[PDB]
Design a protein around this ligand. Structure first.
Ligand code: MYA
Ligand code: 7AH
Ligand code: MG
Length: 411
């Protein structure tokens, strides 16, 4: 069924996943010295290339590969168009490993054919709360706690093979060579997501969308006018009124985050993320990197009460190419990132996110039902989208968990 995934250290079925009771590794313990020094063999007409993702011209070459060949919606109406600034941000967080960014190029002209990127993340990925309870009931607490400590692993994203090279088994070669380069740094697990089903997810969640510019969304067929609106004399007018938002934020003392906020945001975030079974641990440098505002890329606001940061939210921008509309070239989408509320209900905090995104010319706000994102779906008028984002580990057995126990946002 899966000539490649069947050879890999991942759970092979839902049945298998159903059995898993403790977190821990799948594969034989191995050492750096065991791993081949040399890149995985590849056809003599291709060559491996490590782009410098802080060099503009290399970022640009990756940017074009992804712009023309990366993930589309199911009807080939949209394709993600991550910006060059977004790729430098995503691919180069503090202590990133340049060798984990892996490309294939055609040796002749150096056309870029394929890419995959890994970045470091520190993740809590020990046995989940519901399984630790069962473990206590069986007198198996110590085995259940063995891998509780946050682990330094690889987060993989941006796997892409050129549309002309599809279904040539090139993706598995990219994945093998990435795994080699990560293992050569003594890292043995990875976390990744995909909108496709692969062997075998530890969590799965729906996507959600909140319309900000419904006339544009309907025009590009991101959204329809829903059938119930036909009872109205002017369905579109009622649709716009439905999604209208305040022109300015409602929380007094909302402002953009600044460098001086980094310690208080780290504290409130890290306290909040603790309540989830799987989640990242961020240093001050990482909070700085992932949350300080960056034009066109990431937008972060804090609620400041008595010179104190009590709440914050962030979102990032990924535009999508709209394929074949005469009025519009791009869908301007905001994605809910990390947040923490301590002084106000989460719906009141996120309503400000929608207000800001709307004021800044975003067409839609998107998220997956991780974190406590379900708590504000109804009141903030999010609707479920198509399909599901699935979360995976490489070389890590892990009991199935609800997406509301996941706190790792994936770009
Ligand atoms: C410790 C360190 C470990 C580090 C690595 C951890 C693992 C990281 C794993 C990567 C996490 C990626 C996270 C993301 O970025 S998910 C986003 C993936 N990218 C896209 O969807 C962009 C457009 N599509 C493409 O570029 C290609 O279709 C891709 C590259 C996806 C497949 O290229 P192609 O269509 O030309 O096929 P092939 O003949 O070369 O290969 C066929 C094999 O590939 C398996 N396949 C298909 N889609 C995926 C997929 N999304 N993840 C993993 N495997 C996938 C498939 O089941 C089959 O294996 P098997 O079924 O025969 O066994
Ligand atoms: O934005 C969308 C819908 C869409 C799909 C394909 C397009 F070409 C353009 C738009 N879905 C969506 C909504 C919320 C999300 N939160 C995280 C992701 C994924 C983005 C791609 N990398 C993996 C995470 C994500 C995806
Ligand atoms: Mg291929």
């Amino acid at each position: 069924a899966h000539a490649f995934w069947s050879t890999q250290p991942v759970p092979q079925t839902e049945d298998e996943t159903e059995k898993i009771v403790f977190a821990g590794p799948m594969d034989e313990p191995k050492t750096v010295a065991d791993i081949p020094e040399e890149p995985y063999p590849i056809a003599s007409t291709f060559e491996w290339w490590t782009p410098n993702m802080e060099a503009a011209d290399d970022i640009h070459a990756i940017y074009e590969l992804l712009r023309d060949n990366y993930v589309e919606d199911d009807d080939s109406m949209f394709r993600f168009n991550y910006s060059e600034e977004f790729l430098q941000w995503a691919l180069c967080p503090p202590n990133y490993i340049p060798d984990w960014h892996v490309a294939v190029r055609r040796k002749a002209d150096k056309k870029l054919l394929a890419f995959i990127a890994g970045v470091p993340v520190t993740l809590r990925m020990g046995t989940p709360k519901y399984m630790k309870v069962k473990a206590q009931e069986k007198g198996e607490g110590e085995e259940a706690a063995k891998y509780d400590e946050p682990r330094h692993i690889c987060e993989i994203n941006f796997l892409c093979v050129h549309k002309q090279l599809r279904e040539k088994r090139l993706a598995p070669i990219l994945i093998k060579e990435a795994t080699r380069r990560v293992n050569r740094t003594n890292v043995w697990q990875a976390v990744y997501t995909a909108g496709v089903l692969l062997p075998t997810p530890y969590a799965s969640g729906q996507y959600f969308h909140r319309s900000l510019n419904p006339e544009k969304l309907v025009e590009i067929r991101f959204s329809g006018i829903p059938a119930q609106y036909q009872k109205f004399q002017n369905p579109m007018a009622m649709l716009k009124r439905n999604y209208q938002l305040p022109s300015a934020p409602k929380n007094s003392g909302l402002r953009e985050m600044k460098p001086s906020d980094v310690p208080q945001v780290r504290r409130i975030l890290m306290n909040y993320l603790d309540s989830f079974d799987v989640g990242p641990v961020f240093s001050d440098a990482e909070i700085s990197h992932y949350l300080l505002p960056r034009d066109g890329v990431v937008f972060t606001y804090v609620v400041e009460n008595d010179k104190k940061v009590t709440d914050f939210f962030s979102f990032y921008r990924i535009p999508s190419t709209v394929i074949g509309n005469s009025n519009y070239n791009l869908l301007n989408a905001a994605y809910v990132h990390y947040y923490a509320a301590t002084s106000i209900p989460l719906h009141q905090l996120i309503l400000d996110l929608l207000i800001v995104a709307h004021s800044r010319g975003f067409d839609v706000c998107n998220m997956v039902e991780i974190l406590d994102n379900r708590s504000f779906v109804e009141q903030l008028k999010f609707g479920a989208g198509d399909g599901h984002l699935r979360y995976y580990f490489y070389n890590w057995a892990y009991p199935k968990i609800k997406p509301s126990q996941v706190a790792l946002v994936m770009l």
